[PDB]
Design a protein around this ligand. Structure first.
Ligand code: HEC
Ligand code: HEC
Length: 190
């Protein structure tokens, strides 16, 4: 576990994009505020490994917008940063019913015809996740971000679910329309 107060001092470069408290309105930059600490730590570690210049291909999580950024930070610094954002208050955004009605049916019901589970079992009915398990909070996340993650899991661009193999398999059954719908619903969910 990290020291949130210490992490508050280690995130100046992050602020422009993620916001000082981890809530920015920038739709492609994920909100970090109130995310589970274990999840954030894993992602920081994975992003650090996959985004360093010369990283071996397919390792970790390669975030182009964060190349080299986490390189000077030690493990404990990443924990402190995770603790800092997890301690912040998340926000909720807009769920357009034209999309979010179908998004809700998918989120709660899955696509059992295609063997795809509902999302609620791991990410909770209100999208708060399960951080003791490391299942991320989704509720309130920017739709464009969420949509990109589901697309990346489906297309094999995001592969840092290897410890569980879960999201690659889930996202494989989602259409572009399904992803748009889910992401809209999730943006307003709490
Ligand atoms: C804008 C140039 C950024 C700066 C500065 C930092 N981050 Fe970032 N972060 C950025 C993007 C575009 C993304 C998403 C990439 C993609 O998949 O589409 C990210 C992602 C993260 C995450 C993952 C969050 C999740 O929900 O899985 C984390 C934990 C993260 N960023 C942390 C982080 C920190 C601690 C930074 C300062 C050291 C930082 N980011 C800067 C864009 C930008
Ligand atoms: C448990 C069996 C799960 C089910 C069913 C679904 N998800 Fe999931 N999801 C799970 C884990 C273990 C992870 C973490 C992978 C990692 O990198 O450690 C996730 C992650 C996501 C994300 C990424 C969130 C982020 O902040 O980047 C998204 C957007 C997500 N999951 C969406 C999602 C949806 C919409 C699902 C139903 C169709 C769903 N997941 C099911 C575990 C599980």
């Amino acid at each position: 576990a990290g020291d949130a107060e210490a992490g508050q001092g280690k995130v100046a470069v992050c602020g422009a994009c993620h916001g000082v408290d981890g809530n920015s309105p920038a739709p492609n930059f994920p909100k970090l505020a109130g995310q589970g600490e274990r999840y954030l730590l894993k992602q920081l570690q994975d992003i650090k490994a996959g985004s360093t210049p010369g990283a071996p291909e397919g390792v970790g999580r390669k975030v182009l917008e964060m190349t080299g950024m986490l390189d000077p930070l030690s493990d404990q610094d990443l924990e402190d940063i995770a603790a800092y954002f997890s301690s912040q208050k998340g926000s909720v955004g807009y769920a357009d019913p034209a999309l979010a009605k179908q998004g809700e049916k998918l989120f709660r019901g899955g696509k059992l015809d295609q063997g795809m589970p509902a999302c609620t079992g791991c990410h909770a009915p209100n999208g708060v996740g399960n951080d003791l398990a490391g299942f991320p909070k989704l509720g309130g996340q920017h739709a464009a971000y969420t949509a990109k993650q589901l697309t990346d899991f489906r297309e094999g661009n995001r592969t840092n679910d290897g410890d569980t193999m879960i999201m690659r398999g889930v996202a494989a059954k989602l259409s572009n329309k399904d992803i748009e719908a889910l992401s809209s619903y999730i943006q307003g969910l709490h």
